[PDB]
Design a protein around this ligand. Structure first.
Ligand SMILES: [Ca+2]
Ligand SMILES: [Ca+2]
Length: 156
């Protein structure tokens, strides 16, 4: 039987990545919301690159949103987000801060506790744009670059 809430997951074709602070290689912003667990967005990792970095997703219409799931890159820890901010907008110009938060880490504070989908819930807000910002991340250099395999959105 279904997980409470799962019927409200939006198809990934409804999510367009319209902005990211930077990108590396072929790890395009669009890959954070292409419904493919195997493709990632990864921000750039040259000397002047640093956190924070953001990625902005446009939905096909406004929704009443109350959750996104963050899926970490599945075959490497580089860019795993550990602290994030969520903002939303109706017009891609006036932003509301909807939450900041942390994803759980291990005892050492150097690896994610949950390698799968990490739920990020917030009070329902009508929005057509959501900006996800990586404030802290893990990697072979920590707190420098972010990645995301998927951002799954829930709304009505
Ligand atoms: Ca998409
Ligand atoms: Ca992907």
């Amino acid at each position: 039987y279904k997980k409470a809430g799962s019927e409200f997951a939006l198809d990934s074709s409804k999510l367009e990545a319209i902005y990211a602070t930077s990108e590396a290689d072929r790890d395009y912003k669009e890959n954070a919301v292409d419904g493919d667990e195997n493709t990632i967005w990864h921000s750039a990792y040259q000397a002047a690159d640093k956190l924070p970095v953001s990625i902005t997703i446009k939905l096909d219409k406004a929704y009443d949103l109350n959750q996104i799931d963050y899926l970490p890159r599945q075959n490497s820890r580089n860019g795993h987000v550990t602290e994030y901010k969520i903002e939303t907008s109706l017009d891609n110009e006036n932003w509301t801060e909807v939450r900041t938060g942390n994803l759980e880490v291990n005892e050492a504070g150097n690896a994610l506790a949950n390698r799968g989908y990490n739920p990020i819930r917030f009070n329902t807000i009508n929005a057509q744009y959501l900006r996800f910002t990586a404030l802290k991340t893990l990697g072979d250099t920590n707190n420098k670059y972010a990645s995301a395999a998927e951002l799954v959105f829930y709304g009505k």
